[PDB]
């Protein structure tokens, strides 16, 4: 296992280029399924793009995940889906010798989710085939969240020929997304080593073709350890939002709002918060009937409390006026 420790250290050094890797954060992708459970469809697509990018970047850097899963997918306070915990200690073609150890090590969510190629069964270093199988399994799980397409028992039956994920697939709503995730997820005597082809297929329709080139870039840049402060990061976010608007003339607004909330955890400069509201105000045009109402009220109120009378005054004014234009209401 210790040798696998040096292997994982080298894989982390390699994946350093992989901004989609996170070797505390908000939670795991399955944890985000559980706690803080606002898995928006826009966020989902963004998480899928981030996961495909993380797997491809780890592979290219020289990192094979093998056991990518929703539980294994890391997210930050802004839903930063970053691959990590590459199972260099777990077998590439995992032996079926002991299922007790398989549950004790591979599964950490209690759903026994088995993101392993059936060719990883009975007839060193990791393989991109097992990594891609696990990643497709994690994508399908994100499509079904709680539903493990094949648990330890389910995957064992599939390898032995007793379980089929047809049902769990039915958990996923999007037909094309499920189709691609399953095409990734099959018996893998022929290794679909990398997720680059899937990334290319999704960027046409699923992944933002051009928006991500900027959204993903700003996300990685401001991710953490960024020189600019959260308030400075917010001013830069205002600039980048003007840029995105010019590009156009949910999604980022969703993801952008995600990061705004993530940073909102701290106070920093008061006038900084005032501006943030001012900017957060503009973004609402799309999210009015969405995660905005979901938490925009939450922060706007949380923001409108502290000290400064006129500060909280304008804060409530925004919280409302933005809250106003909505024309539909969730229960």
Angle at 71 (CA atoms; ends 237, 75), nearest 5 degrees: 10
Angle at 199 (CA atoms; ends 196, 201), nearest 5 degrees: 115
Angle at 201 (CA atoms; ends 213, 254), nearest 5 degrees: 45
How far is Cα 232 from Cα 238, in angstroms, rounded to an integer? 10
**End-to-end alpha-carbon separation of the chain, Å?**
52
How far is Cα 259 from Cα 252, in angstroms, rounded to an integer? 9
* Residues carrying an active site annotation: 67
**Dihedral sign of CA atoms 113, 119, 125, 127 in order:** negative
Name the 3-class secondary structure at 154. Answer: helix
How far is Cα 22 from Cα 168, in angstroms, rounded to an integer? 28
Closest CA to 12 of 49, 61, 60: 61
Residue 61's CB: how many other CB atoms inside 10 A? 17
Closest CA to 59 of 195, 201, 261: 195
DSSP characters for 243-291?
HHHHHH--HHHHHHHHHHHHHHTS---HHHHHHHHHHHHHHHHHHTTTH
Name the 3-class secondary structure at 87. Answer: coil
Technique used to solve these coordinates: cryo-EM
- Sequence length of the chain is 331
How far is Cα 224 from Cα 218, in angstroms, rounded to an integer? 11
**Resolution rounded to one decimal, in angstroms:** 6.8
Burial label, 30 (beta-carbon count in 10 A; 0-12, 13-18, 19+):
buried
Question: Do 199 and 49 touch, CB atoms closer than 8 A?
Answer: yes
Helix ranges (DSSP H) in the chain: 2-15, 29-34, 41-61, 99-105, 128-144, 152-160, 166-171, 175-184, 196-204, 211-222, 230-248, 251-264, 270-287, 291, 297-303, 309-324
Q: How are beta strands 27-28 and 82-83 bridged, if at all?
A: unpaired
**Block residue for tokens 């997918």:** 73
């Amino acid at each position: 296992l210790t040798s696998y420790k040096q292997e994982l250290e080298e894989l982390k050094i390699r994946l350093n280029s992989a901004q989609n890797c996170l070797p505390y954060v908000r939670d795991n992708l399955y944890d985000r399924i559980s706690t803080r459970p606002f898995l928006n469809n826009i966020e989902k697509r963004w998480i899928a793009f981030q996961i495909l990018t993380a797997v491809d970047q780890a592979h290219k850097s020289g990192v094979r995940h093998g056991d990518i899963k929703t539980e294994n997918v890391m997210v930050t306070s802004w839903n930063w889906v970053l691959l990590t915990d590459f199972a260099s200690f777990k077998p590439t073609y995992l032996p079926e010798d002991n299922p007790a150890d398989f549950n004790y090590f591979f599964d950490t969510s209690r759903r026994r989710t088995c993101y392993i190629a059936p060719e990883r069964f009975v007839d060193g270093e990791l393989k991109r085939a097992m990594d891609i199988f696990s990643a497709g399994c994690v994508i399908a799980e994100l499509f079904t969240e709680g539903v493990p397409l094949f648990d330890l028992s389910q995957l064992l039956a599939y390898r032995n020929g007793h379980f089929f994920p047809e049902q769990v697939l039915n958990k996923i709503e999007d037909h094309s997304i499920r189709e691609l995730v399953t095409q990734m997820i099959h018996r893998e005597p022929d290794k679909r080593l990398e997720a680059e082809d899937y990334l290319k297929q999704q960027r046409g329709n699923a992944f933002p073709e051009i928006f991500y080139t900027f959204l993903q870039p700003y996300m990685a840049q401001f991710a953490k350890e960024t020189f600019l402060s959260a308030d400075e990061r917010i001013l830069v976010i205002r600039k980048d939002l003007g840029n995105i608007i010019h590009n156009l003339c949910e999604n980022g607004l969703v993801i952008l709002v995600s990061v705004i909330t993530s940073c909102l955890q701290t106070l920093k400069y008061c006038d900084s918060k005032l501006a943030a509201l001012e900017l957060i105000l503009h973004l609402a045009p799309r999210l009015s009937v969405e995660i905005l109402l979901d938490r925009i009220t939450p922060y706007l109120l949380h923001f409108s409390n502290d000290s400064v009378p006129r500060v909280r005054a304008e804060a409530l004014r925004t919280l409302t006026k933005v809250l106003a234009l909505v024309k539909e209401v969730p229960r």
